[PDB]
Design a protein around this ligand. Structure first.
Ligand SMILES: CC(C)CCC[C@@H](C)[C@H]1CC[C@H]2[C@@H]3CC=C4C[C@@H](O)CC[C@]4(C)[C@H]3CC[C@]12C
Ligand SMILES: NCCc1c[nH]c2ccc(C(N)=O)cc12
Lengths: 57, 275, 240, 338, 128
């Protein structure tokens, strides 16, 4: 009972997995690059903050 | 005849000062090194620093070049008492370290429970107190110094010299040797039981420590105890043994810090931390 | 700016109080010792815990010997998989691996080989490399009973037992049948071979023939912890 | 009967693979060839927090980037002040085996758990008492691997029983349960919107779940061993995972497959934690080698190393503003890098 | 994705020789230690044999020592199990198992519940 019960639920879930809207991987990579470049300036690790305002220093 | 001995003694004093300062400042800066087992080493380093600051330099300069006591009568009683007190403190700090190691290894499940900074401080205070009591009789006139308008030297009376040497070196030396023999016995007993027919080393370190301490301090105290039996001794032997006694303080950082895994590994990080 | 100075003084007073409490807890923690109890499901660990005492994922049982306190943890409702939560006991004083030496529908599975493999896996674990393990070879009476019965699993499931010879270092108690001693020492030697192949010196094993009803079990743990801490102190001072 | 279900599952998996394969005309690495290199990155330890007696497993940054949470096996849950280094609270825990901790977004409550299989919610804003236990979220059948707050009354928890659940703190009952993993669930990560979250397990795979529906949406199987850590990309459309494979992998929910792989020949040790910078350009992943590595999210090249820990780096955390990087290690010392 | 595919099986008379295969794929075969597992009817999982990374070290359970031979091929990325003189008690479903982490000597693939890194297995039966 356990084997078939688990298998049926797994098949049902995998059927949903096969029906989903997606986007081109190149488009996703372009969006990732755009996000990385458009938010680079407000990242202290990537763009060091001036020492005069850093509270840790 | 020009002699290179002038640079050697100043170099030794500077090296001792630098080593003691490095040890103490590294313990203070590296907070994780602050543990009860390390307070004894810190106290030993502080005693070594005191010796190198306020004991050796006067000898190294004046007794080497001038060869005479140019600091007057009053400074003689300060110098003699300070040297005796600092050396006795160093010896008894070594003895206390040995006793602490003996207690720790002999009673691992019990003694470390009460190993706390307060106990370490109390034992260091007792060591310094006793090292100070040894220099009292000269101040109260029981054994006046044999100093002169141009010479400074410790009193040679039997009733003070024998007591001082016994309290400072002989009893602590015997205690240290007994504790280290017990440590060696326990370590080898532990090592021998952890063996099997097949199921299909401490001697080196202990000998290093004991030999260093003995080779450095024993001759000076032997001569000092035999000093009253004048029946005079050459100056060079009288001073080389004292300089070996100071070399004991010089070499102490290289012994108790190198032969300690936590300190041995921790100081290696100073290569990057200094930047 | 008094509004800032008052806050900074209050925060320093609170820090001092917390530091004092944590310092006291430090003495409490250092005084205490911690132990882990492991082993197979059918082993006698339950009876050993029960005799020491006289839905949760872990159970606590504390016993005091010679005024030094020991804390022993028994794994409760946890998944049979062990690789991911066994790592939490790297700093424990020692691991108590009670394994049943029974040599018998009844033979639903051969858990002796499974226990040997589990011991090997624990031994080879990267984060347990400094955790000594105490090996309690439990169920000696049943082993002897099955050896006398002439139906032990030792001969069939371990073919090397035929050529096995009793070690000269063996110290069997008087009255023990030679076959029982040979079997128990073969079981010992299997675990010793598993454990002595590392050669790194970061480990050590303490085999111990014992029974769940034996009262000496508590003393053995105390002696083993004493030895382990003594060896640790020897290591610290460069003596080893 | 089984054969007429396993074959259907295999056919569906093949269809999914074919759909994903046909979508890979160009990879992230190929098009990013024109991106300017980040260059070498160097960081210095600005703060060191001491007081923990045992090894530290997990930490959580407060929403104000001022307070910190640390959990250690000594039984102490300490709330730090990252700027002044002072300790604000030190809560003694009934169970010394705690594997995770979390700080509520409003800061009114704290949580922790571990081998005890129970999550304890601690209230720091009690009127007179400095700290007390509010509720015990019992019901799991295994050690609590990770937990994260959604609101002041809702918390998501993970356990080694291959199950995750949503708990109503007011009543303590499981409002929703997540199942599907064949192995232990290691870490959780809340999405920026908090509606979706992604959990890593020992199945060498990752799954995405919805709190409002409690059902899986996507499954990713790019890794080869247990997933130690997981974290969403700041935009929320992608995430990165750390595993025992010693190789970090980047996954995008819309691409529905691996985008980048971060690894090198000299690195063969497992990865303990993974985190994102505020811009997402740099990957901060802890390693068993006692040091952390900075990997370029786009170029997949090392930018720097955070070395100085004497033991395993158990956890890694970045402030909300991203101005500081806090790292925890089994040595019991918390180091802040900036 | 990690996938394991056991091959071979069937019903043979006592003493027959059977060759089992495991076409391991989807992962770096050379980087993981490989073990064979079996489960007799009505009984739990039991370890059979193991092979190291390059095969320099091999081990077998006492009940199957000598009778069974475990070998692996890196060029073909497949594992073998050559059975000889099979006894009737050897009947069991055999699984191809891999322990989770590479470059490690400790494996944990004797798990009772579902294990993520073992194959579906093949049924091997021996009867008169
Ligand atoms: C007869 C005349 C020439 C004898 C003169 C005494 C000379 C030899 C004595 C007086 C001061 C003494 C030095 C004092 C300090 C030390 C440091 C020790 O680590 C090595 C010996 C050394 C360097 C001594 C060498 C010998 C010395 C120079
Ligand atoms: N340079 C060491 C001086 C010293 C320390 N303790 C002593 C004890 C006795 C005598 C002595 N010469 O009597 C000298 C000393």
């Amino acid at each position: 009972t356990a084997s078939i019960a688990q298998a049926r639920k797994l098949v049902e879930q995998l059927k949903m997995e096969a029906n989903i809207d997606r986007i081109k991987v190149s488009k996703a990579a372009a969006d990732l690059m755009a996000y990385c470049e458009a938010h680079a300036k407000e990242d202290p690790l990537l763009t060091p903050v001036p020492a005069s305002e850093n509270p840790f220093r | 005849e020009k002699v290179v001995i002038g640079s050697i003694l100043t170099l030794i004093t500077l090296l001792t000062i630098a080593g003691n300062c490095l040890v103490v400042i590294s313990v203070c800066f590296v907070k994780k090194l602050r543990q009860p087992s390390n307070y004894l080493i810190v106290s030993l380093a502080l005693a070594d620093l005191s010796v190198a600051v306020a004991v050796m330099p006067f000898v190294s300069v004046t007794d080497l070049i001038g060869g005479k006591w140019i600091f007057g009568h009053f400074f003689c009683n300060v110098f003699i008492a300070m040297d005796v007190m600092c050396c006795t403190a160093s010896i008894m700090t070594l003895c206390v370290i040995s006793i602490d190691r003996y207690l720790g290894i002999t009673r691992p499940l019990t003694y470390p429970v009460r190993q706390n900074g307060k106990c370490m401080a109390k034992m260091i205070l007792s060591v310094w107190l006793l090292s100070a009591s040894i220099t009292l009789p000269p101040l109260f006139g029981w054994a006046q110094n044999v100093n002169d308008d141009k010479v400074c030297l410790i009193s040679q009376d039997f009733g003070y010299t024998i007591y001082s040497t016994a309290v400072a070196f002989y009893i602590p030396m015997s205690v240290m040797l007994f504790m280290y023999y017990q440590i060696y016995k326990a370590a080898r007993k532990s090592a021998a039981k952890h063996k099997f027919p097949g199921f299909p080393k401490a001697a080196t370190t202990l000998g290093i420590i004991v030999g260093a301490f003995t080779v450095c301090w024993l001759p000076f105290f032997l001569l000092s105890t035999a000093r009253p039996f004048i029946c005079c001794i050459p100056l060079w032997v009288e001073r080389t043994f004292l300089w070996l006694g100071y070399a004991n303080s010089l070499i102490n950082p290289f012994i108790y810090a190198f032969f300690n895994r936590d300190l041995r590994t921790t100081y290696r990080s100073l290569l990057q931390c200094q930047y | 700016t008094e509004d800032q100075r008052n806050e900074e003084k209050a925060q320093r007073e609170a820090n001092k109080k917390i530091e004092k409490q944590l310092q006291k807890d430090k003495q409490v923690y250092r005084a205490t010792h911690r132990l882990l109890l492991l082993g197979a499901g059918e082993s006698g660990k339950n009876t050993i815990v029960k005799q020491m005492r006289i839905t949760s994922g872990i159970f606590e049982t504390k016993f005091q010997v010679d005024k030094v306190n020991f804390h022993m943890f028994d794994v409760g409702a946890q998944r049979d998989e062990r690789r991911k939560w066994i790592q939490c006991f790297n700093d424990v004083t020692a691991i108590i691996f009670v394994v049943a030496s029974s040599s018998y529908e009844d033979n639903q599975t051969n858990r002796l080989q499974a226990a040997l493999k589990l011991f090997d896996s624990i031994w080879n674990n990267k984060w347990l490399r400094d955790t000594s393990v105490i090996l309690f070879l439990n169920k000696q009476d049943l082993l002897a009973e099955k050896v006398l019965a002439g139906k032990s699993k030792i001969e069939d499931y371990f073919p090397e037992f035929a050529r096995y010879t009793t070690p000269e270092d063996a110290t069997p108690e008087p009255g023990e049948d030679p076959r029982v001693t040979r079997a128990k020492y073969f079981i010992r030697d299997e675990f010793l071979r598993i454990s002595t192949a590392s050669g790194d010196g970061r480990h050590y094993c303490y085999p111990h023939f014992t029974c769940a009803v034996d009262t000496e079990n508590i003393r053995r743990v105390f002696n083993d912890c004493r030895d382990i801490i003594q060896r640790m102190h020897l290591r610290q001072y460069e003596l080893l | 009967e089984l054969d007429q279900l396993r074959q259907e599952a295999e056919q569906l998996k093949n269809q999914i693979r074919d759909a994903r394969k046909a979508c890979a005309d160009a990879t992230l690495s190929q098009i990013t060839n024109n991106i300017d290199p980040v260059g070498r990155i160097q960081m210095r330890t600005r703060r060191t927090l001491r007081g923990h007696l045992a090894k530290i497993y997990a930490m959580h940054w407060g929403t104000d980037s001022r307070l910190l949470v640390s959990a250690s096996q000594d039984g102490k849950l300490i709330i730090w002040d990252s700027y002044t280094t002072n300790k604000v609270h030190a809560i003694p825990l009934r169970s010394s085996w705690v594997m995770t901790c979390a700080y509520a977004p409003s800061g009114n409550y704290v949580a922790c758990g571990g081998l005890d299989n129970i999550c304890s919610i601690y209230n720091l804003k009690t009127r007179e008492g400095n700290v007390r236990v509010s509720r015990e979220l019992a019901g799991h059948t295994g050690y609590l691997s990770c937990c994260r707050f959604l609101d002041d009354n809702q918390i998501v928890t993970s356990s080694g029983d291959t199950t995750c659940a949503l708990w109503d703190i007011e009543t303590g009952q499981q409002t929703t349960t997540f199942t599907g993993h064949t192995g232990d669930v290691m870490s959780l990560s809340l999405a920026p919107d908090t509606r979706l979250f992604v959990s890593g397990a020992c199945d060498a795979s990752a799954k995405l779940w919805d709190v409002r529906e409690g059902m899986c949406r996507q499954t990713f199987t790019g890794h080869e061993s247990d997933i130690n850590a997981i974290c969403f990309f700041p935009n929320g459309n992608a995430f990165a995972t750390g595993s025992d494979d010693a190789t970090c992998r980047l996954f995008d929910l819309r691409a529905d497959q691996e985008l980048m792989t971060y690894s090198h020949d000299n690195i063969i040790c497992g990865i303990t934690s993974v985190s994102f910078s505020k811009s997402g350009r740099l990957l901060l992943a802890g390693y068993d080698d006692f040091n952390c590595n900075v990997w370029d999210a786009l170029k997949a090249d090392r930018a720097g190393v955070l070395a100085g820990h004497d033991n395993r780096v158990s956890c890694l955390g970045v402030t909300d503003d991203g101005m500081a990087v806090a790292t925890g290690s089994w040595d019991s010392f918390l180091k802040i890098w900036n | 994705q990690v996938q394991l595919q056991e091959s071979g099986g069937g019903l043979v008379q006592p003493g027959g020789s059977l060759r089992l295969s495991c076409a391991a794929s989807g992962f770096t075969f050379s980087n993981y230690k490989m073990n064979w597992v079996r489960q007799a009817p009505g009984k739990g999982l039991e370890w059979v044999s193991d092979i190291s990374q390059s095969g320099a070290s091999i081990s077998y359970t006492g009940s199957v020592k000598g009778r069974f031979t475990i070998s692996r091929d890196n060029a073909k990325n497949t594992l073998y199990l050559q059975m000889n003189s099979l006894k009737p008690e050897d009947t069991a479903v055999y699984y191809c198992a891999r322990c989770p982490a590479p470059f490690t000597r400790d494996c944990f693939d004797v798990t009772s519940t579902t294990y993520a890194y073992r194959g579906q297995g093949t049924q091997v039966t021996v009867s008169s």
